[PDB]
């Protein structure tokens, strides 16, 4: 599986039949059909204690890994019941500035999309979490090209070191708080992972307000390789999956 013509998203159903399921992500967020829900509580992001460990290029993106052996960085409140631990964050970007995001807003696509992955601490590990309907909680942040994001520079600078698939680098004392928008207004609906295995174990929390990043910050993303070292270079671009059918599901707004 990849994002190429021959192993692309249109082919995932073959190896992963859930690709055609009832609660697949991403989806188009129709802001006029979204249901404002008052009973929705405010999001609770406690990342003060976050412990970043390393960064790795897994051939389809780069992951910043956190120590989830304890409740250091958690997510609670909103639509969620119980606490979710941060395990990793990664992005989805485009070849050009007019594409890259997975989720769209009134059909509008952003340059990138940030996903902070959390697992329900009542299931004990990530492994078991992927076996439950309420196992995961994904925090989605849209990215747009504008002014630089100071808090992303650290990441941007480490990329040189993990250019090819399989590479990794120590990446400690990285604070995710610096990737958060001003507002915490959000859309929420029941979805899935946007990459194989595409498990329908996720509660999606997409923030309304996007973070802005400089063109030169996005450029460094586009310098990455899908390929391993010593193989023909295939730039890591367009690593996003097209919007899926909502299929009777209802998208709710906290605003
Ligand atoms: Hg599941
Ligand atoms: Zn993702």
UniProtKB/Swiss-Prot annotation:
pH dependence (record): Optimum pH is 6-8.
Keywords in alphabetical order: Acetylation, Cell membrane, Cytoplasm, Disease variant, Lyase, Membrane, Metal-binding, Osteopetrosis, Phosphoprotein, Zinc
Main location, first listed in the record: cytoplasm
Effect of residue 117 to K/R: Strongly reduced CO(2) hydrase and p-nitrophenyl acetate esterase activities
Reaction(s) catalysed (UniProt annotation): hydrogencarbonate + H(+) = CO2 + H2O; urea = cyanamide + H2O
Domain Alpha-carbonic anhydrase: from-to ranges: 1-255
Subcellular location: Cytoplasm; Cell membrane
Binding, Zn(2+): 90, 92, 115
Effect of residue 58 to H: Reduced proton transfer
Top-level enzyme category: lyase
Result, substituting residue 193 to E/H/R: Strongly reduced CO(2) hydrase activity
Protein name per UniProt: Carbonic anhydrase 2
Organism: Homo sapiens (Human)
